[PDB]
Symmetry: D2
Subunit: 345 residues, 4 copies
């Protein structure tokens, strides 16, 4: 047995990270209030827009904290219209070879220093929540969340695993609202199945805070919604939104969507997120109540850059997918806030 398993190394149990970086009272309040605010929006009891916005992935805690400071100030100013949550993702999932993210490779040197990465990742989440800014995460696996989910106010399940039973089980026990992405061809069937599955109670094997496998029972997660992220062609338009609202009603689910402005929805050209924003704002200002959230890939400095062995990097600029910069980000957030005003007034 174990002929294709080469070596096994020690992993800090979640409780070690929880003890080292405990939620402050401010941090816990940030998380509790944002989860509640998002629930309220999902129930239709609040007409504000959930905005999940931030870097494609975090490679530098310094830049991430400056970004947080900037975003926090807009969160405060636009709070009457928007529930602003910072995107704090640690990995860009990909087919090709490349950087495995901040948890796996925090020192960006193609080694795996996961114990280091988990420390760095938790400490960043802690600092951001502690400043008053809520965080959104992505769940790619079953083990990472035990280290980090207590600091997450919203989460997405990876696009390649919306159909996976193990990832749906995960969602059904998460303490935060959860977004499920539509199919790569832009169909919503798999995401609807995922929402149903996740809303149900489940019993399954998982790793506990003590780093031991155990049998776990979940209550089911009713705060799960679809994320529209395009198929071949984009799917943010008033037409596609109507199609999805129809499918959702037909399935017995609340007719609400989050729209991902990036990638397929913007033809993989970062500046085009501004065109998606313009269209989406039009729908909202017109009277669309079903768009309950959006997601935008945004950083201090626009564009992206490629990681290169022994060379320094531009500050505040993505090393994964290209993002809009701060200037566009400020304009975009203001457009959405104004759109939310216009909708009700």
């Amino acid at each position: 047995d174990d002929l294709r398993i080469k070596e096994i190394k020690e992993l800090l149990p979640p409780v070690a990270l929880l003890e080292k970086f405990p939620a402050t009272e401010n941090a816990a309040n940030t998380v509790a209030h944002a989860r509640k605010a998002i629930h309220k929006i999902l129930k239709g009891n609040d007409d504000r827009l959930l905005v999940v916005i931030g870097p494609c992935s975090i490679h530098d805690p310094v830049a991430a904290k400056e970004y947080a400071t900037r975003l926090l100030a807009l969160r405060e100013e636009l709070k009457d219209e928007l529930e602003i949550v910072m995107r704090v993702y640690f990995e860009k999932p990909r087919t090709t070879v490349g950087w495995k993210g901040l948890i796996n490779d925090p020192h960006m040197d193609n080694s795996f220093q996961i114990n280091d990465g988990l420390r760095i990742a938790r400490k960043l989440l802690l600092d951001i929540n502690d400043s008053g800014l809520p965080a959104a995460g992505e769940f790619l696996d079953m083990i990472t969340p035990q280290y980090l989910a207590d600091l997450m106010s919203w989460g997405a399940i990876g696009a390649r695993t919306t159909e996976s039973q193990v990832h749906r089980e995960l969602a059904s026990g998460l303490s935060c609202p959860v977004g499920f992405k539509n199919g790569t061809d832009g169909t919503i069937k798999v995401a609807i199945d995922a929402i149903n599955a996740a809303g149900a109670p489940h019993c399954f094997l998982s790793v506990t805070k003590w780093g031991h496998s155990a049998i776990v029972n979940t209550s089911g997660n009713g705060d799960c919604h679809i994320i529209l992220r395009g198929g071949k062609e984009p799917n943010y338009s008033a037409k596609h939104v109507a199609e999805v609202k129809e499918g959702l009603n037909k399935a017995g689910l609340p007719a609400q969507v989050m729209i991902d402005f990036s990638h397929a929805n913007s033809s993989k050209q970062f500046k085009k997120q501004m065109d998606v924003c313009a269209d989406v704002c039009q729908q909202i200002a017109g009277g669309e109540k079903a768009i309950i959230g959006v997601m935008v890939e945004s950083h201090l400095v626009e564009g992206n850059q490629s990681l290169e062995s022994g060379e320094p990097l531009a500050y505040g600029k993505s090393i994964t997918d290209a993002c809009i910069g701060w200037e566009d980000t400020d304009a975009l957030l203001r457009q959405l806030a104004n759109a939310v005003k216009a909708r009700r007034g």
Copy 2:
């Protein structure tokens, strides 16, 4: 801000406990080692026989399963020159939404989730089957269960709904057995091709050890992986589709070899039509198609299925299967097609 949707947490026996209680016998270990070697030889293109993965959609009754195994073992022996027969022993079921997830998750089928019981039952059965001399195949859905059973598995499948899944591709990369990847539920071949490439590469990721502890594990990569055609919007078992897949495989620099699942979307969810698929596939094989190295059939003692009162004997409680009579005949057809292809 923790544990609000976690209702209860209960003790789980570690793999090492199941391994100690139910160690592989000499025979069990022999069966596994030979079958893995034999499938490898088939995948390398150095043996012209056909890998046949056949058995129930799911195991729910160890007794019926042991009878089934007794019968199949005879045919495995009789047809050994044409077919490498391996029994489906699926303890885990991916649901489209919700439902019974299999023997391990709920051995008593009453939503009591006696998983410790399920693990003991499943290992005992697997051990017994291998000990008689019949190799076993299972779907690896769960990230934590494989440590309790894998040493007794001769071949594994990653389901259509998890072929795109990073963690499952990592799992495959560390499995000691050959692994098949089903095409996507919409019929997409690319995802499985990416899966094969990913699983052949070494990985480093979080997993659970034999002692039940989470750890960082490094895998070597698994070169014995292949695609499983299982249809999409329409069936994809025909020579036309096979031609396309072989082409797609070559482009990706992979060996042009397929396994064909006769059931699911390929039979339009109608169990009888597996006989039709069999007819068509035997044609391609008899006609000279060497790229078809394997098939997968959903088979039980009694055909059809039932809903989960006590239950009817020998009948699937999940997907509908063909009965034993059709099974014996299906297998003989396949062996004859292999006869034809050779000489």
Copy 3:
């Protein structure tokens, strides 16, 4: 500033793995459950029979041990109206040499502890399954999780009677526990131990899952003294009366177990037969405070160094003929004491 003096760390099977591989049969579970009950009644003073723990100094050979167990079981059934016969199944001889069956089951200094645990639990299981209860010695706080469920009685090591961690262990054991008196023959430490082990405790221990945890115990009211001599033997009627007075003064039931071996026998194995005659006289004469004895016995008498069969490789024991005689003598004393 860690692990300078730690050379190597190797994986240890958790107790659940040995519990799962070697579960108690119905017969084994009944043997343990009944012998514990019986011993309790003797200690409570509601049964006039005598507990007899008897067997090899240490087990090095499972085959010879199972042969001994078979012979003893016959005498156990025969003398059951007078005697509660329990086999001594000790896997190590504490000393300042061979590290015992659990540490070195292959007798070659290779420390195959996972093997030793399997062999020890298997042996214990077979003995209990046949109907013969077993007595163990608890030298550490981890070993018991693997074997304690197949033990109807246990002794705390002489060297650890004073130790708070071993007293804590005793307070949570399911079986009755014996505490040896002091090397100088005094009983103060053993009286402290019994009082400590009788109270509930909270302390860190390792679970059946092989993880450390916080454990709370109820306290063990089934602890008693074991007289094993000091500078001089302390088995005489004089000494028993002294010990009884101290127990009474300390508000403890005035009862003792007497070890026939070692210091009480001046380190000569046949002298165990002398202690037997002395103890028998006391019992037959009407001494009710003697509730048990401990005897070092094998198939073949004497000992040897590191190989003859069924002969001790540690301290010397009486052989099987003396053992038959010794057990009958005791049974006869109990008849005389009773009617």
Copy 4:
């Protein structure tokens, strides 16, 4: 199983406490230097006296830190003569039953909040070492050492466990020097056997920093020595010291002793530690080289007090054995330093 086991509760693994409270550079320096200093003394390459001195038990971090400040000042002033290490004892062996100490029951109300106790104990040990003051402990429990041993410069195995094989095994793998007390009846042989046992490599069952049981192999610890703590009568006097030196040499060990001024050497009368001090000082000034260490029970305020009365505790005063107060401690330390200087002269 489980018949006399009432409850089993989760325990933080040592890695959790090490991650939450890692050694600072200065704390690590304090430990490294003190261990090296003690080793040099025990090898006979330094003529200074090891002095282990402090409370019978710690029950209050605040008084403990005030005490440490005062002791550190004298450590600095007297360091040419004395290697001063503070008694930081978190575990207490009871004759029968009683409060087992801060780790076992930090809130002193039989709530047994051991997780709290461990956090409190490590943090205190860290603070003391960081200030520059090395710490000594008693190693009683088989599981607790992993939580604290990295911050200990010296350890003792109590009189009631000197004969215990698992304690000798523990010592054989400890990274610090270790004193073994003579028997509670005054027997010397058990401690000599302990020293020899501890010097040898062992293989035995223990618990790792992950809180898992395992098989460990140790190398043996050559930095062990005897502690003279009295018997039925005290054994600190010259006559007794000569007997012990001879016994040690006979067993092939260097003739060296630490003398505990308290417990049976003071007939459990706390002020008699000053009389023991006078006699031991005369021995040392007279030219006795074998006395390499002493141990003294000392607190801010002399005497002791009872937990069970339910009266609010007086500050800086022992709730276990009675100690000398600060003013006597200062005097006693100066006497010892003067004696060491005379010995050298």
